[PDB]
Amino acid sequence: NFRVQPTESIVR
Amino acid sequence: AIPTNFTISVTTEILPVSMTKTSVDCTMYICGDSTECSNLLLQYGSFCT
């Protein structure tokens, strides 16, 4: 399937 | 006994032909957005294939 890799990372 | 009168009757019949086709991706059903899961499932790639 069309898998999109994460670009950035956020922490809340 | 000899029949003298007859009656014409039409009946119906319901019989399936095919079914809905579905596909199941092993890597997406077991893992999805992980790397260690894929690395551990690579050893079980024969079952998914």
UniProtKB/Swiss-Prot annotation, chain A:
Superkingdom as given in the UniProt entry: Viruses
Residues bearing attached sugar chains per UniProt: 7, 9
Physiological role: Attaches the virion to the cell membrane by interacting with host receptor, initiating the infection. The major receptor is host ACE2. When S2/S2' has been cleaved, binding to the receptor triggers direct fusion at the cell membrane. When S2/S2' has not been cleaved, binding to the receptor results in internalization of the virus by endocytosis using host TFRC and GRM2 and leading to fusion of the virion membrane with the host endosomal membrane. Alternatively, may use NRP1/NRP2 and integrin as entry receptors.
Subunit note: Binds to host ACE2. RBD also interacts with the N-linked glycan on 'Asn-90' of ACE2. Cleavage of S generates a polybasic C-terminal sequence on S1 that binds to host Neuropilin-1 (NRP1) and Neuropilin-2 (NRP2) receptors. Interacts with host integrin alpha-5/beta-1 (ITGA5:ITGB1) and with ACE2 in complex with integrin alpha-5/beta-1 (ITGA5:ITGB1). May interact via cytoplasmic c-terminus with M protein. May interact (via N-terminus) with host bilirubin and biliverdin, thereby preventing antibody binding to the SARS-CoV-2 spike NTD via an allosteric mechanism.
Name under which the protein is recorded: Spike protein S1
Species annotation: Severe acute respiratory syndrome coronavirus 2
Name of the gene encoding the protein in the UniProt record: S
Swiss-Prot record, chain B:
Protein name: Spike protein S2
Organism listed in the record: Severe acute respiratory syndrome coronavirus 2
Disulfide bond entries: 26-48, 31-37
Gene field: S
Protein role: Precursor of the fusion protein processed in the biosynthesis of the S protein and the formation of virus particle. Mediates fusion of the virion and cellular membranes by functioning as a class I viral fusion protein. Contains two viral fusion peptides that are unmasked after cleavage. The S2/S2' cleavage occurs during virus entry at the cell membrane by host TMPRSS2 or during endocytosis by host CSTL.
Annotated glycan sites: 5
